[PDB]
Design a protein around this ligand. Structure first.
Ligand SMILES: CCCCCCCCCCCCCCCCCC(=O)OC[C@H](COP(=O)([O-])OCC(O)COP(=O)([O-])OC[C@@H](COC(=O)CCCCCCCCCCCCCCCCC)OC(=O)CCCCCCCCCCCCCCCCC)OC(=O)CCCCCCCCCCCCCCCCC
Ligand SMILES: CCCCCCCCCCCCCCCC(=O)OC[C@H](COP(=O)(O)OCCN)OC(=O)CCCCCCCCCCCCCCC
Ligand SMILES: CCCCCCCCCCCCCCCC(=O)OC[C@H](COP(=O)(O)OCCN)OC(=O)CCCCCCCCCCCCCCC
Ligand SMILES: CCCCCCCCCCCCCCCC(=O)OC[C@H](COP(=O)(O)OCCN)OC(=O)CCCCCCCCCCCCCCC
Ligand SMILES: [Zn+2]
Lengths: 45, 121, 67, 104, 431
């Protein structure tokens, strides 16, 4: 705003830690076929 | 015993007074002659001038709070009232349940509703 | 000057005491606090301001969390 | 009115709505309807809200104004430059905050 | 012979022993030191000492009365003993100075002096009365975080913040008329008593005391206030016993009387019919022990409380008396059962019949408050002699075999082995 820490910084601080956990929950809500393929005998386990 | 048949809405005395006289041998029956019960009650009312089963959206002209409430009428001890602001469509429809022993306060409009419970149970 | 202040033992440790208090004592200290608030506010002692805030706004009853 | 509300019409409408309340339900209702809008209200609204909570004579809604406001604002520099504008009303009205009342 | 009549409000209970001299009229309330929170605690003892103060006792002594009071864990009593031709004086004194206005009792001079004397005698009890304070700590850790856990005398930390507002709130919340019972022992007839309670209008309030949210549940615990300044080692362990108006009450008192009480220095208590005294008498493992059986309104305790000058062999005393406790379930005889039957009849006769008519007033008030009418000494004797060895074995398998115990100790108790050995020596592998 006018006086205070700037809105770019005070919403980047709120949202930049949220992007990594969004990527984590999407990489484990769509990426568990990779985790089940990784242990099977098709990958010469 | 002796029973007449309620020529208009003033002389009804229950479900034994709405019978009416039958048609003759040659004439087609009119609805005033043969219709009985609730339909006869609505017909007699509409011929007198009034109509029973008073359907009307409630008065949302004034707001009204606990000095003088919005007075609603019911033949039972509760009446579900959907408030929609001090104009007709101010905020979204919030349903309140005013009963005989408690007023109903809107929490978004702020208006209050109180009964005059007619009853006769 | 008419109403009396609540004593210390009736009102100590009230956020840790509100759940197991009987329902006849809760109405009594609720009445006593809602008449103590009709004074000037600066003469309300700091023991009972926390009591009023937990009674009217605490995490009990209606404001109990779902988890 | 589905047309937008400018800030001066906002503060005048709500000052005339805080002046009229008499019960406790009315003060908390108009306080919730003032805080659940998009903007944070200027202290001309909230010192009138403190007076309207004083008229009904109950304390904790003259504290939850301050905590709801701390949830409203975007940082704490806005909160401190806000709270030194309502200093003397908080002094002679004698209401506390949360962080000094419940130290945790 | 113990007649009870319910009036408009109060319940009158009396027994007329025409050979006794001093007739004793008082009121017994059903709200003791387990009907409050742990912050206003000791307000019952403070009310007792307000009633027993110098002002009230001088007013009662100028007319020819002698006040008494007794605070327990669910009933509290206020007894005005008197001469037999003078009990209307007792009744209208107890009306005019306890049941109606108490503004002469509750101003800040008498209350200040009474609170100071109560503080001094409670701290003198806490320092210099060691077996009663470890029975009290046993009660405080057995039923903890639950309203039966409270000290009867009250703690010092929750007694210096009590004012007249606490006492007036307690007298409004617990000195009721659906909570009170007026009692008469000594040699007053029944109908002149109720005639004098119904001539002058005597009614305290109308309402009902607040019901508690948490019932008394046993929690197997442990505590030790080891002060090695002290010369002895007072420990006491106890399991959950049967409460009052329970069917297994008299078998709990009989199972306590099986092991009895002992005193190592009297030469007539060293010769009893206990099998434990052939184990604890060759190295002198203890000085005394007494097996209590307390039965309150919701639950109760069952255990022994000892004192030991031989502070190195504490665990041997614990282990020997716990093997004797397991002998109740596995191989209790019938001669122990009949010895305890006769001794329990003797003990209940010494308790119910005695010279003092205020102890009978307290017992009658308690057991008319909780039950509704007093069972006589004959029916209690019949219920005692109707007990077979198999009922004792069934109760001991119910409440004593591998049950959770609670221990409270003080003194030199490092020789007391810690908890899991004492807990799992309540159950042996069948020898
Ligand atoms: C190394 C570990 C050493 C552990 C010592 C121990 O556990 O003693 C504690 C405990 C001390 O009890 P206490 O304080 O003396 O209590 C005496 C009372 O009379 C109450 O004691 P009690 O009567 O309950 O204990 C008497 C016990 C005594 O048993 C024996 O002495 C013979 C066991 C064979 O009788 C039995 O154990 C009967 C069970 C037999 C087990 C059968 C299945 C296993 C076969 C081996 O004794 C036991 O629990 C017995 C454990 C089993 C015996 C040790 C076997 C070692 C073999 C190698
Ligand atoms: C969106 C979801 C993306 C993540 C999928 C995880 C698959 C992990 C796995 O199981 O991949 C295992 C396969 C192995 O197969 P291979 O050819 O090595 O077999 C040889 C055996 N001897 O890896 C691949 O082929 C390609 C690598 C992964 C490609 C991701 C999927 C691409 C097509 C999208 C299909 C989904 C359509 C959804 C439609 C709405
Ligand atoms: C989301 C949470 C639930 C996922 C469950 C998936 C299990 C599928 C399965 O059953 O996995 C089958 C595979 C392939 O085994 P295979 O075909 O060689 O075995 C031939 C017959 N036995 O075994 C494994 O990889 C075992 C390791 C499992 C790892 C799961 C990781 C999930 C992330
Ligand atoms: C200075 C150091 C020198 C060495 C010291 C000795 C070190 C010993 C090391 C070996 C451990 C021996 C285990 C004995 C267990 C015992 O005997 O079990 C005695 C306990 C007595 O329990 P309780 O009645 O008190 O309570 C219990 C609740 N009433 O019965 C039990 O719980 C039974 C538990 C199962 C027992 C079998 C476990 C396997 C033992 C065989 C394998 C041993 C290796
Ligand atoms: Zn509305």
């Amino acid at each position: 705003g006018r006086i205070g820490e700037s809105w770019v910084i005070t919403e980047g601080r709120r949202l930049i830690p949220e992007i990594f956990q969004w990527s984590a929950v999407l990489s484990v809500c769509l990426g568990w076929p990779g985790a089940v393929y990784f242990f099977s005998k098709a990958r010469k386990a | 015993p002796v029973v007449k048949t309620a020529q208009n809405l003033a002389e009804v005395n229950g479900p034994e007074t709405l019978i009416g006289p039958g048609a003759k041998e040659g004439t087609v029956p009119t609805d005033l002659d043969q219709e009985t019960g609730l339909a006869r009650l609505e017909l007699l009312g509409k011929l007198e001038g009034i109509d029973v089963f008073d359907t009307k959206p409630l008065d949302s002209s004034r707001k009204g709070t606990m000095k003088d409430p919005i007075i609603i009428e019911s033949y039972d001890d509760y009446r579900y009232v959907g408030c929609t602001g001090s104009p007709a469509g101010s905020h979204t429809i919030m349903w309140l349940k005013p009963t005989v022993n408690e007023v109903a306060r809107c929490w978004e409009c702020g208006s209050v509703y109180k009964l005059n419970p007619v009853g006769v149970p | 000057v008419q109403t009396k202040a609540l004593s210390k033992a009736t009102l100590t440790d009230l956020p840790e005491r509100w759940e197991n208090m009987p329902n006849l004592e809760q109405k009594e200290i609720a009445d006593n606090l809602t008449e103590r608030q009709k004074l000037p506010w600066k003469t309300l002692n700091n023991e009972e301001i926390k009591a009023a805030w937990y009674i009217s706004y605490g995490e009990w009853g209606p404001r109990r969390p779902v988890h | 009115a589905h047309d937008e509300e400018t800030f001066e019409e906002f503060t005048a409408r709500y000052e005339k709505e805080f002046d009229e309340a008499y019960d406790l339900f009315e003060v908390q209702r108009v306080l919730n309807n003032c805080f659940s809008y998009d903007l944070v209200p200027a202290p001309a609204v909230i010192e009138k809200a403190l007076r309207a909570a004083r008229r009904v004579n109950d304390l904790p809604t003259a504290i939850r104004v301050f905590e709801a406001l701390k949830y409203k604002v975007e940082n704490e520099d806005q909160y401190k430059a806000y709270l030194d504008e309502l200093k003397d009303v908080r002094q002679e009205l004698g209401v506390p905050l949360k962080e000094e009342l419940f130290p945790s | 012979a113990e007649v009870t009549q319910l009036s408009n409000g109060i319940v009158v209970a009396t027994e007329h022993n025409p050979s006794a001299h001093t007739a004793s009229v008082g009121v017994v309330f059903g709200s003791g030191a387990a009907n409050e929170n742990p912050y206003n605690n000791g307000v019952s003892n403070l009310w007792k000492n307000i009633f027993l103060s110098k002002e009230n006792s001088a007013v009662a002594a100028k007319e020819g009365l002698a006040l008494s009071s007794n605070i327990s864990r669910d009933f509290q009593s206020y007894i005005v003993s008197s001469l037999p031709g003078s009990t209307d004086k007792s009744l209208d004194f107890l009306n005019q100075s306890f049941i109606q206005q108490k503004a002469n009792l509750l101003s800040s001079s008498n209350f200040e002096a009474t609170k100071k004397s109560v503080l001094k005698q409670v701290q003198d009890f806490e320092e210099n009365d060691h077996p009663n304070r470890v029975l009290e700590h046993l009660h405080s850790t057995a039923f903890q975080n639950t309203p039966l856990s409270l000290p009867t005398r009250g703690t010092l930390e929750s007694l210096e913040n009590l004012v007249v507002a606490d006492l007036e709130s307690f007298a409004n919340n617990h000195f009721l008329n659906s909570n009170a019972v007026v009692v008469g022992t000594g040699n007053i007839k029944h109908e002149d008593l109720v005639n004098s309670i119904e001539s002058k209008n005597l009614s305290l309030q109308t309402g009902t005391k607040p019901v508690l949210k948490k019932k008394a549940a046993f929690l197997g615990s442990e505590v030790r206030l080891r002060d090695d300044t002290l010369p002895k080692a007072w420990i006491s362990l106890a399991v959950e016993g049967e409460p009052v108006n329970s069917p297994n009450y008299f078998v709990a008192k009989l199972a306590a009387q099986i092991f009895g009480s002992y005193n190592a220095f009297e030469p007539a208590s060293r010769l009893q019919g206990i099998k434990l005294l052939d184990n604890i008498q060759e190295y002198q493992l203890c000085d005394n022990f007494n097996h209590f059986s307390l039965s309150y309104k919701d639950s109760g305790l069952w255990g022994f409380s000892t004192a030991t000058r031989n502070v190195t062999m504490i665990d041997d005393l614990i282990h020997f008396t716990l093997k004797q406790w397991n002998r109740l379930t596995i191989s209790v005889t019938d001669t122990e059962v009949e010895r305890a039957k006769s001794l329990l009849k003797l003990q209940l006769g010494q308790l119910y019949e005695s010279g003092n008519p205020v102890n009978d007033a307290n017992l009658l008030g308690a057991e008319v408050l909780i039950k509704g009418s007093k069972l006589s000494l004959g029916e209690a004797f019949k219920k005692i002699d109707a007990i077979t060895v198999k009922d004792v074995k069934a109760w001991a398998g119910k409440r004593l075999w591998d049950q959770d115990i609670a221990i409270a100790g003080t003194g030199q108790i490092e020789g007391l082995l810690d908890y899991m050995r004492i807990r799992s020596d309540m159950s042996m592998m069948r020898w």
